């Protein structure tokens, strides 16, 4: 399993991008609900009411049952259109947030993948350190048994051996935790991963910070989100200001009513004013409403919206400054990493020379096995440091590409050419 397959699996089963996608879908679906008031509304409603007279209308009772089908529809109301536009802009900013989440997922899976290799190298170094320290302790015990040193030296050697045993346990647990983090981020267990290739790995100079700034000015996700938020704030100003405008609706209604009268007074000489009525009305009409002075209300709302727009502009400026600073820092990090890579490579060469010196002396007869074991420990430490620096450089490339807002799986595909050989991640298998 290399980085490409790991990321392909992670993109599928990861319960952090699915939630953002669902939130995006809900925000996009809200457009229909925002547009719903514009569409015609209609309903049906029936009722039945019995009334009993009192005082002057003594002995008068009525029973009226009504059923009305109503259909209302607006004609000119800018508030609904403004709300629809606001919902559209909110959906856009939510989509921008989802894109940002995708970029963070890519970065997270890359970092979690490289942590496992770093832990593997650390454990491999710790195993050699343990072997060398155990041989040193055995040497000290032999010298004491023959008799050349005091008991304090033996106690110190045993203390150092116990310390290295604890360090080995800590490194093993670190590897286990790294594998568990990878499983948490991918929802799968990986028993073997692709490791770095020494020959295929080359470090290239980054493009000038001027081009980086030029691309990040117009392609960064945070800047686009801030600009869209400012546009939404302006639309909010306009929607709040639209409270001065009048409104106009049209209604239609078909109503059927059935009324019956009873009581002592009705059962008399009323003749025509007290009779059961079977009424039917197909009411159709318009309605116009123009609000006038309502205290502060709309004026205060406009002032508040203007202040909110000012705040949004300040947020946009702050976002631009932060983006510029982030781009500059991420550009400097790459050069720092290149220098660190060169230094660690030279240190590895020196450690190899020292190990060869110890081996030659041991073969000739001027050295012991403990010396070559310590040289091997130092060489392993240098190798681990160099590998960690290389992984840091590879991560810094992705950080540079993410600062510009142009991170996608093509970068991972390009990076995948440096991972060639498989290595197991079982702590017992790598170091029994």
């Amino acid at each position: 399993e290399n980085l490409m397959q790991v990321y392909q699996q992670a993109r599928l089963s990861n319960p952090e991008l699915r939630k953002s996608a669902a939130d995006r879908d809900a925000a996009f679906e809200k457009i229909n609900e925002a547009r719903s008031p514009l569409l015609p509304q209609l309903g049906l409603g029936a009722d039945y009411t019995y009334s009993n007279g009192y005082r002057d209308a003594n002995g008068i009772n009525s029973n009226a049952t009504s059923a009305s089908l109503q259909l209302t529809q607006s004609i000119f109301d800018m508030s609904k259109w403004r709300a629809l536009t606001l919902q559209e802009k909110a959906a856009g900013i939510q989509d921008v947030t989802y894109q940002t989440d995708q970029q963070t997922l890519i970065l997270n899976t890359a970092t979690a993948y490289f942590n496992v290799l770093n832990a593997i190298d650390v454990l491999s170094y710790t195993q050699a350190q343990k072997e060398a320290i155990y041989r040193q302790l055995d040497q000290t015990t032999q010298r004491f048994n023959v008799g050349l040193v005091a008991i304090t030296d033996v106690q110190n050697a045993r203390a150092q051996y116990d310390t290295v045993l604890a360090n080995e346990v800590t490194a093993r647990n670190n590897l286990d935790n790294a594998v568990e983090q990878l499983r948490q981020i991918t929802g799968n267990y990986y028993p073997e991963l692709a490791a770095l290739n020494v020959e295929n790995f080359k470090t290239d100079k980054p493009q000038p910070v001027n081009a980086l700034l030029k691309e990040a000015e117009k392609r960064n996700l945070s800047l686009l989100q801030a600009r869209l938020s400012q546009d939404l704030a302006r639309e909010q100003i306009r929607q709040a200001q639209d409270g001065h405008l009048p409104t106009l609706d049209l209604t239609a209604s078909t109503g059927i009513s059935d009324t019956s009268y009873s009581g002592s007074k009705t059962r008399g000489a009323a003749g025509t004013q007290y009779d059961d009525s079977n009424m039917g009305q197909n009411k159709v009409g318009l309605s116009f409403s123009l609000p006038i002075y309502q205290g502060g209300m709309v004026n205060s709302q406009v002032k508040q919206a203007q202040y909110n727009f000012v705040g949004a502009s300040e947020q946009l400026e702050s976002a631009h400054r932060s983006v510029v600073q982030t781009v500059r820092s991420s550009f400097n990090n790459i050069n720092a990493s290149i220098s660190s890579i060169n230094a660690y490579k030279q240190a590895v060469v020196s450690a190899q020379s020292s190990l060869d010196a110890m081996e030659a002396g041991y073969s000739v007869g001027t050295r012991t096995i403990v010396d070559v074991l310590d040289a091997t420990t130092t060489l392993y430490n240098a190798k681990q440091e160099l590998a960690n620096a290389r992984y840091n450089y590879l991560i810094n490339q992705l950080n540079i590409k993410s600062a510009l807002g142009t991170l996608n799986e093509q970068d991972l595909l390009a990076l995948n050419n440096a991972l060639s050989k498989p290595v197991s991640t079982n702590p017992e298998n790598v170091a029994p």
Binding site: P15, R18, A21, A22, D25, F28, E29, N32
Partner: protein, 152 residues
């Protein structure tokens, strides 16, 4: 009227056969199959395991270490099959950006209930069951979920 555009593109790569669809529908069908045939054999359940529960269960059976787990029951918190099952309700699923949907199933033996929980994933174009987490007192054996129980 507008229609939402699904965030994801494929959400697929399904190998084995699978049932029509519906998360609660698929879980209820699985439990009905379990109750109807009292064999609880793995190979007849293949259209219900996803792509990895099948191979994990096959390798566990061939490993000759989890015989007692497999014989009694692998898919429930109790060694004996239940009398009735009621899978929780999920009111449909829009588009295709939906995985890892767990449902709390309520299983009833003779005046008993354990309320297990099953995972469900899409993995292609249908709905499929995965994991199962033994969410009941007096757990059958091993630990936690079935995958944690049979993983090495």
């Amino acid at each position: 009227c507008t229609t939402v555009t699904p965030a994801y593109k494929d959400n697929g790569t399904r190998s084995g056969p699978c049932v029509e669809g519906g998360p609660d529908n698929v879980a209820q069908q699985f439990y009905d199959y379990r109750i109807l045939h009292r064999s609880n054999d793995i190979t007849a359940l293949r259209p219900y395991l996803s792509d990895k529960l099948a191979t994990l269960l096959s390798d566990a059976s061939r490993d000759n270490n989890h015989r007692e787990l497999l014989t009694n029951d692998p898919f429930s918190s109790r060694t004996t099959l239940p009398d009735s099952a009621h899978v929780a309700s999920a009111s449909t699923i829009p588009n295709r950006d939906a995985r890892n949907i767990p449902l709390r199933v309520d299983l009833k033996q003779g005046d008993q209930g354990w309320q297990d929980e099953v995972l469900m994933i899409q993995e292609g174009q249908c709905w499929v069951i995965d994991d199962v987490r033994y969410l009941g007192g007096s757990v059958h054996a091993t630990a936690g979920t079935l995958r944690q129980s049979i993983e090495n």
